Design a binder for this molecule. Sequence first.
Ligand SMILES: [Zn+2]
Ligand SMILES: [Zn+2]
Ligand SMILES: [Zn+2]
Lengths: 231, 202, 107, 606, 47, 57, 100, 167, 222, 59
Amino acid sequence: GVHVSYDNSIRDADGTLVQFMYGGDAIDITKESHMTQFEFCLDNYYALLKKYNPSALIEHLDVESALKYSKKTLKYRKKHSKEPHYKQSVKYDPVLAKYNPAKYLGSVSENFQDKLESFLDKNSKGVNEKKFRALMQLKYMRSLINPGEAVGIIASQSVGEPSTQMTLNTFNVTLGIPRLREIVMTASAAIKTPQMTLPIWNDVSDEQADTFCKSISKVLLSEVIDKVIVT
Amino acid sequence: NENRETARFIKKHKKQVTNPIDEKNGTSNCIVRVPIALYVSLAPMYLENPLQGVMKQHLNPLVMKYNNKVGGVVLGYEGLKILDADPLDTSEKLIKITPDTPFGFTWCHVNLYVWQPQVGDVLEGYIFIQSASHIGLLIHDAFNASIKKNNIPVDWTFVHNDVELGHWVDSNGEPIDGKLRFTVRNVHTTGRVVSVDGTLIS
Amino acid sequence: DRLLNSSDYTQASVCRECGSILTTQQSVPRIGSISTVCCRRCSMRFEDAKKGEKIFIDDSQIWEDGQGNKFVGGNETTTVAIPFVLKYLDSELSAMGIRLRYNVEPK
Amino acid sequence: MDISKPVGSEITSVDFGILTAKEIRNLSAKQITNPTVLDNLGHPVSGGLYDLALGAFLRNLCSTCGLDEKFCPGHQGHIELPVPCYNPLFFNQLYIYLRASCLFCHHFRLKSVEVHRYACKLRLLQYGLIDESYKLDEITLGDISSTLLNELKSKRSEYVDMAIAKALSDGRTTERGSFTATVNDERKKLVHEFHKKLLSRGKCDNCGMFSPKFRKDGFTKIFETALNEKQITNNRVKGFISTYILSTEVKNILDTVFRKEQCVLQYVFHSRPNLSRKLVKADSFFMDVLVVPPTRFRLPSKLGEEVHENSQNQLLSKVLTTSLLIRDLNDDLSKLRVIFSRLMNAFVTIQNDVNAFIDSTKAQGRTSGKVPIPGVKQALEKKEGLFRKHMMGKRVNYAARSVISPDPNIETNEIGVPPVFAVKLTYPEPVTAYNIAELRQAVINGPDKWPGATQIQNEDGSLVSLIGMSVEQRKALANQLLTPSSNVSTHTLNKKVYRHIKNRDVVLMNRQPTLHKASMMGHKVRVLPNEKTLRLHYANTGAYNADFDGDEMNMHFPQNENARAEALNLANTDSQYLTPTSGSPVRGLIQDHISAGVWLTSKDSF
Amino acid sequence: TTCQFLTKAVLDNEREQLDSPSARIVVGKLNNVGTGSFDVLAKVPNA
Amino acid sequence: KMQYFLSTGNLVSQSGLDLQQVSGYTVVAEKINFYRFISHFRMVHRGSFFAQLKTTT
Amino acid sequence: PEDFQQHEQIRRKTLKEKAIPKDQRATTPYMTKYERARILGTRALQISMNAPVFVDLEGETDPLRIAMKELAEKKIPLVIRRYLPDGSFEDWSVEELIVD
Amino acid sequence: MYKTEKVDLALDPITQHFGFGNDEWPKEWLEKLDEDGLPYIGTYVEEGDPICAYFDDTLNKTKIKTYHSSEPAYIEEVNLIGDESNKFQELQTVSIKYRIRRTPQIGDKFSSRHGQKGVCSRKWPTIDMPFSETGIQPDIIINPHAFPSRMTIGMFVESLAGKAGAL
Amino acid sequence: TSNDRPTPLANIDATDVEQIYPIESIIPKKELQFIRVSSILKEADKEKKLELFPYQNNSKYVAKKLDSLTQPSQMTKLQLLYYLSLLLGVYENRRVNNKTKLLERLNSPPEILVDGILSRFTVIKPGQFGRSKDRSYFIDPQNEDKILCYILAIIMHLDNFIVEITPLAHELNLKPSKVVSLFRVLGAIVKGATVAQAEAFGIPKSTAASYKIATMKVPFKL
Amino acid sequence: TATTLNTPVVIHATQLPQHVSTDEVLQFLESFIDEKENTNLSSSISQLKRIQRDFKGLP
RNA sequence: GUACUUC
DNA sequence: GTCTTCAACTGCTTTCGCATGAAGT
DNA sequence: AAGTAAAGCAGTTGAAGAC
Ligand SMILES: [Zn+2]
Ligand SMILES: [Zn+2]
Ligand SMILES: [Zn+2]
């Protein structure tokens, strides 16, 4: 019963939600095709520009609102650029947080505009960049997930279709069906082989890590006995 | 809890409005006009006139018959007004169509005329048929009537004819005109045409 | 259309104040009356129906069953789309002691 | 479902309930007394199991409804029992109250302070007041005088009434009461706390005496136990301050404690604010009658040589013959010992018969049966989930299943279907001036040759067949397809012609076992009067993951143009070119056209 | 385990809005998902 | 009685036999292939009791 | 009939309060594929029962194809009534809705 | 293929007589049944065709037991079976054998001894198939695109061996 | 008090075989007084004595009992024999549901005789359009079991209470097993034919055990 | 005949029936006939004019 | 119910 | 420093109950 | 002959104010 409601939020039958928006992006897999290779749309500029027809949607939505606040978020984000989010403030919430991409033009994701401005940074190319920016903007907005689609069964299909192929026993830890079926449905508890990965600093060496390996590794008391003779 | 059960039994049989006597003209004003809320469907063939559609399918055969809710025989309609499913003063309306059938569901209230005879009132009747145990009475020549053999006075007698129906002789022995006072006893409409039953002893 | 329109569609009779589909009666009609459908659960025996003067009846509620008994009640009943296995589901869940009651709109 | 006759109502909400000792008397039409389904000579008996009162049986005329087995929807009946029985569907629930309720004070062994505490916190929990729920607990201000407990109760009332007032005042909740996916977690945690309550400890704070513990017999006959010396000594000092339990005793116990603790009982058995203000009784858990399904639903099944009645008729017959045994039992005592051991055994066996009708994993371990008889719930769950056979997916009509075959020269969406499947499968289409030229051809041809029509229906909803009418009748009916209705009562509707198939409609296809989104696709068909089996495409087998080594898929046909619309725009193959798993297009020719493609586009090809 | 689940349900006597598709398949009007999460109206000129 | 055992397939043993399964003892050769006739006369079935066993040892 | 007036008043006030004006609407102003197939199906069953068509038919004998022909010229006289999880509707008119 | 069906009477004197009686019975179905209620040999039977038209003692009429399948087929024999007894007992069990036309059409499955299988897609004559310079016409054609994965090279070595074994 | 039996009410304390089941239980007093058949024993031609009975068919079963009674000393044997004509007509034409279409076959039968049969051997169907024509009815298979009672209880008095099993099954179009079982519900005793009863009809003695007959002894079996 | 296509499924009175006079039926029925005249209803017209000759004149 | 077979 | 009332506790045993898609005989 | 886990049970389980 989970599905994207008509307010760009995945809701249940009763009305409770799962997330604020589908993966924070709300773009379908059937349209996530050329969102990382801008050389494709740049090489077929007039091709897709004729079929998207941005001139028919200039009097329909707003442009300067989400672009002004996007420049505000881009500036406030590029100023800090040094420390993670355990001390950095969130005074400028993302354009996705206040504006869903289905109301106006400009509301985009984070990795999309980051790799976009990276592409534009290493792009030196007779088409200009302004109408190409509105071109890719309308292209990203067109790929917005249609509200009302059964995204749930799609998600279970994404985790069920590989299950027909990933069925293999051994291709130290558990893998495959005994692990997937264990975590998803068996009410995960104390497991046969628990695992945890511990990083280390750059000054410590491998000749010092094994010392902590022996100190932390629990040894049985019976493994220091040659033989047990009793008369 | 004894009267609590009968509280629902009494509020389902009590008549809403009564028909008293007026002007002492013998009969009584028993033709009332009850506004009713009617929940009906539509037809796509009459989408260009939904009020005319329901008027043709659910309103023209509706007239001149006895129903169960208002408990009387309808005698015309008025006040054809439809209701929308959203707050508006324009002529254009909207009707919620069922996603299963091409018909749409509308909930419109209309004031319907209706005539209901109570038990123990007085009405009019003309001469329609004169049988040996059944006289013909037509109040406003639209509502048929019938009588049994045990609802007539002992003095009122009948005499058969010989030339060419049945003759009747009253207590004093003089015929009267077609205009006849009459009382109401029972009503029945599940047959072909509406017909009321009455008595002659009060 | 795949699940309901194939074979499991019927237009049964549901009552408002009883919320049952298997309890309604299709009684034998009168000599002059036709299509007399009523409900048995929302009806009390006529021998107890008595009375603050004695109120009469408009004869629209009087109807006889097949066995000759007489009980008044259960008048209003509409036609609703119901699956046949639902007509067996409410019969089975009622057989194990649990009562079922739908509701219809309006009211 | 006929598009002519619509539905005049909608089902949008459902509420459960329990039977009442007053309504179990008027819900039936005739009792069932004799322990027999039918006597000799082949006919039912009066007041029998397969009686004509609760429905027709074997083309008989229904005595109550007055109709045959094609219009009578059945009726209801029951059987009178001597003593109220238990219910395994509720025994595991009210036994908590049965083992916790005091026997002399008739209250819960807790104190009225904590009983009203849980009853008040729950009295506030039905609405969306989880914030004020824990705020009710943290109020403690002032073996001890009861006056301070009275003002505590008045404090609980004056606080909850004010909190509920403000909640119902300003936008928080409506009178119907709010219910989310967290308030049930809190209520289930609270009722589980009530199950982990005093029941696992001793003394009663209201009346200080030792009450014996109910020793579970396990699947019937709960029986009491004895006491010890430290219990009877308390029975001596309380002066100045393995036995079976009959049904009427616990009947009076639960009947008194329910009317005594109705303040907490009214909500502990309610999830929503009870507007009707019903009064639950002890009869909600004790069964006085056993309602029987209609005879039309209990038709005696036959398979080959063996002929026998329905499975439920065996257990019910055992209840009938044993109910009459225990019925005539009290007549010996009335006309006034081992007969007392035979009435207690009658109680245990009457119980062992009704609970055997309601459960099978409890009663008699017979010897190698190979299989017991399914009474109610193991027939409602054949392999623990029978709901999947009927309640979840029905046996769908208008189906076609046969082997498949590939075809070239198909633009990825045509499905070659044989005329032998085309003549059977049909589709309704209303008559108008819209298809006066094509429909008259489909009717004038008939089911003998394609394109034809199978059945014709009129405005009144009647069925007219054409498989047994010649071409002359096909002409007299062809000149009648366009004609106004009889009366204005059916002036809006029109006739519907069932035509076989065209090259424009949409047809659904599915491959078993389906395990993903692309394993369920619909296309359009293009008939070919050549051979017998189905036809497929080269690119569709890649999505279905099917082969040609004996694999066969299904052919389902939609009965609505709206289904044709969503199967032409949404379920069409083009919209399913990309599977919504990782962005990998499951489409394209596999082996031969690419292996020849390499030689085609190569430079060594002029 | 619809038996024990019916014990837990009817013991409390809750209210079911038949919103989920599993409930909209046992009674059903259209659905709660897809093209069955809304309704359709029809505008006509006259009043 | 012997005709009933061969017909249905299961044995009515008052005392029971060493093997655990109580079914799957006879088959009907519809006489379709001579290879099926010889192979049916030398069948080696592990046991219907091992049809619900999990491990593939 | 007084109780009926109470039910009439409570449904009136809950319907007007449930409604959303034409300016506070902030949903997607696009023609979805689900609403497309919805109005194509509804138009097909509506026009198959002798309905007044607004576009001339050129020997077209397919209700779905004609319904799409009505969608192309925006002659479709239907209205989309949207829902919300909180139980609140929105009045979408197909006239002011552009198709992809 | 063959389908041997069995018809029985009585599943206490006899109640059914094999054949006709004395009352009036509709004609025109005598081409299939003899005078003793038994069919002929070498006839054509479809669905809705009398096989066992017998007379009754309880109702005194000739009812028809017919075939219930589409299966346009023929019959083979009419075997008479009966039990031994001191006092003679009239026969009440009749068996009959059918032969159905299993014409090789598309949809059927062919396979060799090497493991490879295949379904007949479309029956195609020599009108367009590749002919040899000698004159022989390849009746069956298998795709070379199964060997990369199915790896049925046994068909290769046995085609060369079979070529020499028949050359 | 099983409260119902498919057989009519029979007495158990009677003295004569012809009185163990009185004729009043077949035709009531209101209908037995309208059997004007005294003007039938006057004619001698067998064809003229059959063209006035309510039932005429292609068989000769009614004339089988008509052979050996002409004196008014056997009115009781002949009053029911006249009723036998109006009796077996409702059985072979159980398809018809109304009296008007049923009256088309019976050449002017007494209306009071057939009316009482409907009130006790058919299912009543009320209707104004129906009652305007005549009394509508319907025969459920439970009545098919009750109409076979007067079939097998009046023939007894006709053939002096020696009924053969096989001819009754042929003329009633019923299986001999069903006919024998109907004797057991009426109270009769079915068994093999004795050495004297087998010679009265002319059947071989070697099958007298397998060729059973019908009989009934007094007093009636409790 | 007693279906969802002819008879309305739900019907309930709106408010208290306000009783009317007798002379008003003359104004109602004459306007109803005038707006009507602009198969099973022709007899309804006959009985409508038959109840209109009562309070207006006398045959 | 028991057995058998199709990817 | 001893007599008193009162709220838990963690592990063994029992049980409720589980676990392919479809079809032909 | 296989797994997974909730319910009930009992010996440990002794813990906290007043006189
Ligand atoms: Zn009801
Ligand atoms: Zn019935
Ligand atoms: Zn207590």
